Structure 1
Amino acid sequence: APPALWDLAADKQTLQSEQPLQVARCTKIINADSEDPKYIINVKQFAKFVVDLSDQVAPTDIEEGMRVGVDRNKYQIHIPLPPKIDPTVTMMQVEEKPDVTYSDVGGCKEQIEKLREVVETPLLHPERFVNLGIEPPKGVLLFGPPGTGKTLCARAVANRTDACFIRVIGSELVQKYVGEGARMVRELFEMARTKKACLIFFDEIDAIGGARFDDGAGGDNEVQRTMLELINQLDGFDPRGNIKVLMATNRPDTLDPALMRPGRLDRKIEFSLPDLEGRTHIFKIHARSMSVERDIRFELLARLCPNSTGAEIRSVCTEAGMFAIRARRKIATEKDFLEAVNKVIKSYAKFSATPRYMTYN
């Protein structure tokens, strides 16, 4: 209440400052200009208003499609308001704060290296690649076995140099509203160019990328709104973009978005996935988990779990501590959990052996 006392007591200066700008209702878009003084403007009341502008604002600052203030009495232009947009749709689009730093990598070197130089390196040293130009590529792509998905995008969040970047997923842009995706991708780059340093990311393009055409009834044609328009908006020249966006998905499908990207995008890499000598790297970050006995050999259990990435062997050190408390013991020796690891691979392969070959085949 003491913080709310002086807080509520400030209305004396408020009502004095409430009289000015009170008439700003409502936000109105202009249309065209025949001469300098008079412009036609349209407001959400559905009523269009021709008016001149107050002497406090220069006429050159009024551009076609600019929402500006108003005086409901005189209808004259008051103050411009930068945002034209957008109802909702921002809260799931905007992503802030870091997490998942670079130390979480599972040993992949050349993979994470060449996708680091497409984003982090150009922005950290802009003069480098400009003098070294040539020209940076227009985009990237990610897909393969699930490990490691969606984490590599989280890697750039904690490695972000200055300002947070935008995350977008496909299913949030579904309709209901059609045309937001166009309007969205246009404004985020216009918002970008001011401060630059804002990445655009899209996830799960496979579901929304259904190609190409069917007899009827569509069907895929309403899905063509998502795939074709997004690629088309990516296909612009501006610039395009400064952050060179990003792409991530599950399967390479479909053919049409896959044949469109080589004309624009670049750097298509296939997971990778652990190397036989790289499975111990995910065990290195897990070697700091709980208390690890020095007799444990990570090279021994690595070969026993093929195609386990970092997700399935994350359960190894989990089942380690899992059965540790079940048995009331404290640490977990190699032979302890690996006896359960040979079970966790086979018993979980009874219903599905987790192949990815059958997905695209």
Structure 2
Amino acid sequence: DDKIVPLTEGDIQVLKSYGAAPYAAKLKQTNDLKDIEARIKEKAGVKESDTGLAHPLQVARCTKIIKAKYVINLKQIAKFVVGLGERVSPTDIEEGMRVGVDRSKYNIELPLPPRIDPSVTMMTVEEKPDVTYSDVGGCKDQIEKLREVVELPLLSPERFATLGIDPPKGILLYGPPGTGKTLCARAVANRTDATFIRVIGSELVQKYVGEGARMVRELFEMARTKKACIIFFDEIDAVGGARFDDGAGGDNEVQRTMLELITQLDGFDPRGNIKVMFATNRPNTLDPALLRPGRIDRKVEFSLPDLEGRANIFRIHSKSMSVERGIRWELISRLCPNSTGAELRSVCTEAGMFAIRARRKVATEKDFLKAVDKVISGYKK
């Protein structure tokens, strides 16, 4: 009530100050020119299209110049090709501001790429991932080869050429998916700052046909655009592996989507620069055409070493937590069998609540022992 209303009284007047204030310098500055300049500037640019009534572009309408119109329509209105002989225009074929081939190529260049792509890449690529050393904890043996597969050739391509070779042009990852697995790819991706394409096969098969084919191309297209790029597939099992489900007959395109992926990746794609990487649960599912060399060369598990790896991994993980320095991760690691550089967080990460249940800063041995028990029992899977 009253005294609070004094605060409420202060509330009103305070707000009125700005209200009073805001009007002040308002009088001073008197915003056409931020745009009306640029507007009228780019109104030329606008008009620079608007003559002749005119990076995916899809369609250039650069329109109706007859002497001349110098454009492609890929569209159900007036499809167009400038070529048949030597047909250009000095900077730019013509207009729309759009000048160029749409996407679908007709002659070359012509006006530098107007291009390229519709649906952006419906697939999306994070370059320099948030993982460099992130899950790299305990992951060595894999990365040890990955670095060879990926890092060093990205680093010093010359050596392999100095040798006369390339890196392994394609590589497999399996075990618990993406668990550090993709991130581990993302790791050396950001370790080397190469372009890391995370494309899931889930993206590949969709409502329509040539689906990933379209993608895989655009993939393989912008592969070479993004060159020194990591094409990465988690869920090679999404499109599936080798199968006869063409005997059923509906799968064919899905099968082909692989064969797509299969076909194009084979012949022309530089895999010393453009990296190709696969993640699955089941390497047993592969279409051998995948496992082919010069397509997949290196083959690697994710993996789950020993008591020892886990400790470090534990030791790695728990540094997040406030943790009892007396108790040994070796102690804990002894108990647990081998398990995932994800699951090993259940070791640590679960104990935080133990640490909060026990209300410790630093979880005790049993806190992890229980967690070891609790989690692993809680599996029953």
Interval containing the TM-score (normalised by the shorter chain): 0.7 to 0.9
CA-CA distance at 1:297 after TM superposition: 0.8
Indicate conservation of the 8 Å contact 1:209/1:226, yes or no. Answer: no
Residues 207-264 of structure 1: CA deviation (Å, up to 9, x unaligned): 3125422586434434312222211122123335632311111102425336752463
- Cα distance in 1 for partners of 2:78, 2:377 equals 70
Do the aligned partners of 1:321 and 1:332 also contact (CA within 8 Å) in 2? yes
Report the Cα offset of residue 142 of structure 1.
0.9
Seen in structure 2, the aligned counterparts of structure 1 residues 275 and 6 have a Cα distance that, compared at 3 Å, is farther
- Measured in 1, the distance between the counterparts of 2:199 and 2:259 equals 17
**Structure 2: distance between partners of 1:98 and 1:252:** 25
Which letter maps to 2:372?
A: V
| Alpha-carbon distance in 1 for matches of 2:36, 2:71 | 42
CA distance in 2, matches of 1:340, 1:58: 67
Greater Cα offset, 198-207 or 148-157? 148-157
Closer/same/farther in 2, CA of residues 12 and 261 from structure 1, 3 Å limit: same
1:319 equivalent in alignment to 2:350? yes
Change (3 A) 1:148 1:7: same
| 1:56 aligned to which of 86, 90, 93 | 90
Offset at residue 298 of structure 1 (A): 0.8
CA contact (8 A) 2:210 2:253 kept: no
Cα displacement (A) at 1:14: 2.5
Secondary structure of the residue that 1:21 maps to in structure 2?
Answer: helix
CA distances 1:156-204 after superposition (whole Å, capped 9, x unpaired): 243133x533221111122323224334333444444456222211120
Task: Show the counterpart of 2:96.
Answer: none
User: Residue 44 of structure 2: which of 16, 33, 36 is its match?
Assistant: 16
Q: Corresponding residue for 1:201?
A: 232
Q: How does 1:270-309 map to 2 (within 5 A)?
A: 270-309=301-340
Residue 198 of structure 2 aligns to a residue whose secondary structure is strand
Deviation at 1:317, TM superposition (A): 1.7
Q: Which amino acid in the other structure matches residue 243 of structure 1?
A: I
Distance 1:265 1:91 in 2: 25
What pairs up with 1:36-51 in 2 under 5 angstroms? 41-49=72-80
Cα gap change, 1:292/1:6 in structure 2, threshold over 3 Å: closer, same or farther? Answer: farther
Structure 1 residue matching 2:209: 3-state secondary structure: coil
The 8 Å contact of residues 173 and 278 in structure 2, kept in 1 or not, is answered as yes
CA RMSD of superposed structures (Å): 3.5
Whether 2:275 is the aligned partner of 1:244: answer: yes
Work out whether residues 172 and 300 of structure 2, in 8 Å CA contact, stay in contact via their aligned partners in 1: yes
Summarize the Cα distance change of 1:317–1:86 in structure 2 as closer, same or farther, 3 Å threshold: same
- Tell me if structure 1 keeps the 8 A contact 2:210–2:257: no
1:122: which partner in 2? Answer: 153
List runs of 5+ in structure 1 lacking aligned partners. Answer: 30-36, 60-65, 70-76, 353-361
Distance 2:246 2:74 in 1: 44
After superposition, where does 1:160-309 map in structure 2 within 5 Å? 160-161=192-193, 163-193=194-224, 196-214=227-245, 217-240=248-271, 242-257=273-288, 260-262=291-293, 264-309=295-340
Among residues 186, 191, 194, which one is paired with 1:159 in the alignment? 191
The change in CA–CA distance for 1:254 and 1:321 in structure 2 (over 3 A counts) is: closer
Contact 2:61 2:73 in 1 (8 A): yes
What is the CA–CA distance in structure 2 between the aligned matches of 1:155 and 1:130, rounded to whole Å? 25
TM-score, scaled relative to structure 1: 0.77
Are the counterparts in 2 of residues 276 and 303 from structure 1 also a CA contact under 8 Å?
yes
Point out the structure with max Rg over C-alpha.
2
Contact 1:28/1:67, CA 8 A, preserved across alignment: no
CA distance in 2, matches of 1:310, 1:78: 52
User: Residues of 1 paired with 2:53 and 2:301: CA distance?
Assistant: 55
- Asked if the contact 1:28–1:44 (Cα under 8 Å) also holds between the matched residues in 2, the reply is no
Say how many residue pairs are matched: 327
- Change over 3 Å in CA distance of 1:332–1:196 after alignment to 2: same
Task: State the AA in 2 paired with 1:261.
Answer: R
**More helix as a share of residues:** 2
Aligned match of 2:34: 7
Is the partner of 2:283 in helix, strand or coil?
coil
For residues 88 and 250 of structure 2, what CA distance do their matches in structure 1 show?
Answer: 53
Q: Shift of residue 319 of structure 1?
A: 2.4
State the alpha-carbon separation in 1 of the partners of residues 78 and 188 from structure 2. Answer: 47
Contact between 2:174 and 2:279, CA under 8 Å: does it hold in 1? yes
With 316-325 and 249-258 compared, the bigger mean Cα shift is at: 249-258
What is the match of residue 310 of structure 1? 341
Determine helix, strand or coil for the equivalent of 1:165. Answer: strand
Structure 2: unaligned runs, 5 residues or longer: 1-25, 63-67, 94-99, 104-108
Residue matched to 1:87: 119
Q: Tell me the CA shift for residue 105 of structure 1.
A: 2.1
Cα distance in 2 for residues equivalent to 1:275 and 1:300: 13
Q: 1:87-121: CA deviations, max 9, x gaps? A: 24x25423245312225323243321111111111
Residue identity matched to 2:101: R
Asked if the contact 1:99–1:157 (Cα under 8 Å) also holds between the matched residues in 2, the reply is no
